[PDB]
């Protein structure tokens, strides 16, 4: 909150099965110019 | 007394006269203690390593250090050393 | 001193139930019984 | 792995809190004490001063950071803070007497003690090389969802905690550290709802859990507590002091008790709650002129906690009491201010409920109710030095 | 603290010559499998 | 009750009797939850 | 913290000039052994 970035230990590798465990992936392929996206999922299978 | 100049928790008369350490306490020397067993001890009261090896004199009287070290470098004068 | 309430190394157990039997129930020293066998 | 989660803890500090923590470094004693004592005060010092956004800054730090389990904390307490004024033993002494023990055993036996402000405690026994500067040793088993912020020392790392509870002791038991006798005691916290100087908050609870408590009272009954709640609860509270029924029988007033007795015990009190009263010398069987009232010199307070503190108490009347414990006004000459948990279940009501001015937020609870002492401290108050007195309600 | 479990730090050889100077060693051979132990003797010449 | 004594934030009875999870709190099993 | 020695961080490079910068060296030669010191020498040009 007092503008410092730090990316030292901040790495990916940490959230990438989580991400893609619930959600979708939607792709729109434009000219010359391509989207990846994901979008978070409910499960009805889960009441909570 | 009561008075510990070097913070070892023997006090300076104990260290001075001769004391031995029973329950984790150090304690005022008889001469019947000898027939149980006992090792009476002594020590500088003003260093609290007297042998100025890496343990105080507590430790080394209650033989609180490492127990391969032999028995006759738990007296205060015999330095623990390899 | 004469009570079940000392632990001299600090380690759970009480002195008496070190030097007399002791068992290990609901994660807490109790004094050793014949019956528990 | 502790040091790099104290760096990422603090990382996300915000400026105003890392001064607050780096002055807490090297003026840890009077922060403390401050923080110990700050809601005693009238509206106007508590926000003058000069420490109250230290306090505040730091109090939002520590209560950033929670843990999601129990946990135990290991620290050093004085016995004076759990009502005990002798000595376990000298600090050039060895060895603690069995004596020592029974006594402290004995004033500690079914006692509730408040801790009220900020602490360095330790995650890990201490072992070598740590400080032992007093007797006594604390195993403490904190609850979930409590604050606790690890900050990184020049050489160590440490943590500290703001108290807000009041913790009781199981057991205690003589242990050797390096030759030398301390006490060990286990300890349980025991949770508790605290308005210290939320007044507005403890205002919103109140509203919350009493305004639809008028709804049920017969009317009849409902009218007749407004009304001697609104002119004659002085009254009601002579002819209870002078033991009325026993002297002189009179049903016009009985009638009152028992109807009243009866709305309080209506509803009672949900959850575990602390209530502030000002009490007055002519309650603890003294006068205003009395010289024991003068709680500067040290003999009168030493005098007033030997025969009074670890005693029971019992009030004939009824008991008015406010959430907040800021001062007013109104008990501005009072020196004694009684300290009360309410046990969940017992009888009692929030007359601040019903529109209007009700009171100061206060609270009724049942006749001939009766008390505990558990310890007595003292705090500053301007120019005289002013006496708090710690109490449990009991059934 | 936090419960979980560590293994880093912890040394076998910080504790073999202090279980070697005040244990006895018995071991079972039988014909398939065998077992070593040390269990703990009494030193009669400290009274402590 | 409330007893908890491995300090898990699941009460001791809940754990042997059974217990479900909603709202983030252990609460008494219900076969009508099933 | 205790009365353990640590000798790890503690180099005399931190302290060679200070102590060059405000002594004066005296050598003994003897014999069979020499000995080399520095003593501490005030200066006149500061009043404090
Ligand atoms: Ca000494
Ligand atoms: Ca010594
Ligand atoms: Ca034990
Ligand atoms: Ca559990």
Same mark, same amino acid.
């Given at each position: ?17 989580? $991400? ?25 299978? %889960?009441?909570? | 007394?009561?008075? %510990?100049? %070097? ?36 020590? =500088? ?24 070290? #032999? ?12 | ?37 | ?18 001064? !607050? ?68 033993? *000298? ?27 900020? #602490? ?33 020392? *020049?050489? =160590? ?17 003589? $242990? ?7 006490? #060990? ?55 209870? $002091? ?69 005693? !029971?108490?019992?009030?004939? =009347? ?13 008990? !501005? #000459?009072?020196? $004694?201010?009684?300290?009360? *948990? ?54």
């Amino acid at each position: 909150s007092s503008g410092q970035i730090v990316t030292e230990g901040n790495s990916w590798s940490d959230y990438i099965s989580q $991400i893609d465990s619930i959600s979708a992936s939607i792709i729109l392929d434009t000219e010359n110019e391509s989207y990846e996206r994901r979008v978070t999922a409910k499960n009805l299978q %889960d009441p909570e | 007394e009561d008075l %510990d100049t %070097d913070n070892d928790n023997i006090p300076d008369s104990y260290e001075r006269n001769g004391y031995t350490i029973k329950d984790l306490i150090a304690v005022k020397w008889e001469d019947s203690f000898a027939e149980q067993g006992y090792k009476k001890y002594v020590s =500088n009261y003003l260093e609290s390593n007297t042998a100025g090896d890496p343990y105080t004199d507590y430790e080394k009287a209650s033989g609180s250090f490492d127990k391969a070290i #032999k028995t006759e470098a738990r007296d205060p004068l015999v330095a623990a050393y390899p | 001193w004469e009570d079940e309430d000392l632990d001299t190394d600090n380690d759970n157990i009480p002195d008496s139930y070190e030097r007399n039997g002791y068992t290990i129930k609901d994660l807490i020293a109790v004094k050793w019984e014949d019956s528990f066998a | 792995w502790e040091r790099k989660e104290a760096e990422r803890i603090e990382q996300k500090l915000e400026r105003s809190e890392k001064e !607050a923590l780096e002055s807490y470094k090297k003026d840890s004693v009077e922060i403390s004490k401050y923080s110990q004592t700050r809601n005693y005060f009238y509206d106007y010092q508590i926000e003058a001063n000069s420490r109250e956004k230290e306090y505040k800054e730091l109090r939002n730090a520590i209560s950033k950071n929670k843990i999601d389990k129990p946990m135990y904390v290991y620290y050093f307490e004085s016995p004076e803070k759990f009502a005990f004024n002798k000595v376990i033993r *000298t600090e050039n002494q060895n060895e603690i007497s069995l004596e020592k023990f029974n006594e402290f055993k004995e004033t500690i036996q079914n006692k509730l003690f408040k801790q009220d402000g900020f #602490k360095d405690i330790s995650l890990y026994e201490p072992g070598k090389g740590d400080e032992k500067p007093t007797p006594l040793l604390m195993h403490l088993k904190l609850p979930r969802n409590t604050g606790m912020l690890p900050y990184t020392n *020049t050489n =160590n790392v440490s943590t500290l905690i703001e108290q807000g509870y009041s913790i009781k002791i199981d057991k205690i038991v003589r $242990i050797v550290i390096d030759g030398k006798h301390y006490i #060990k005691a286990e300890a349980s916290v025991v949770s508790s709802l605290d308005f210290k100087d939320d007044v507005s908050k403890g205002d919103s609870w109140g509203k919350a859990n009493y305004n639809d408590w008028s709804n049920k009272l017969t009317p009849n009954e409902l009218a007749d507590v407004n009304d001697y709640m609104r002119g004659g609860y002085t009254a009601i509270n002579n002819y209870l $002091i002078s033991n009325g029924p026993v002297n002189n029988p009179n049903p016009e007033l009985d009638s009152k008790i028992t109807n009243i007795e009866n709305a309080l015990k209506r509803e009672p009190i949900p959850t575990n709650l602390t209530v502030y009263r000002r009490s007055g010398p002519q309650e603890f069987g003294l006068t205003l002129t009395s010289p024991e009232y003068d709680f500067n010199k040290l003999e009168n307070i030493d005098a007033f906690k030997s025969k009074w503190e670890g005693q !029971a108490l019992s009030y004939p =009347n009824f008991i008015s009491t406010s959430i907040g414990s800021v001062n007013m006004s109104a008990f !501005a #000459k009072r020196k $004694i201010v009684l300290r009360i *948990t309410i046990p969940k279940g017992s009888p009692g009501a929030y007359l601040s409920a019903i529109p209007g001015y009700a009171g100061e937020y206060e609270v009724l609870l049942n006749h001939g109710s009766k008390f505990k002492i558990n310890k007595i401290d003292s705090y500053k108050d301007g120019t005289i030095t002013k006496l708090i007195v710690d109490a449990t309600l009991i059934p």
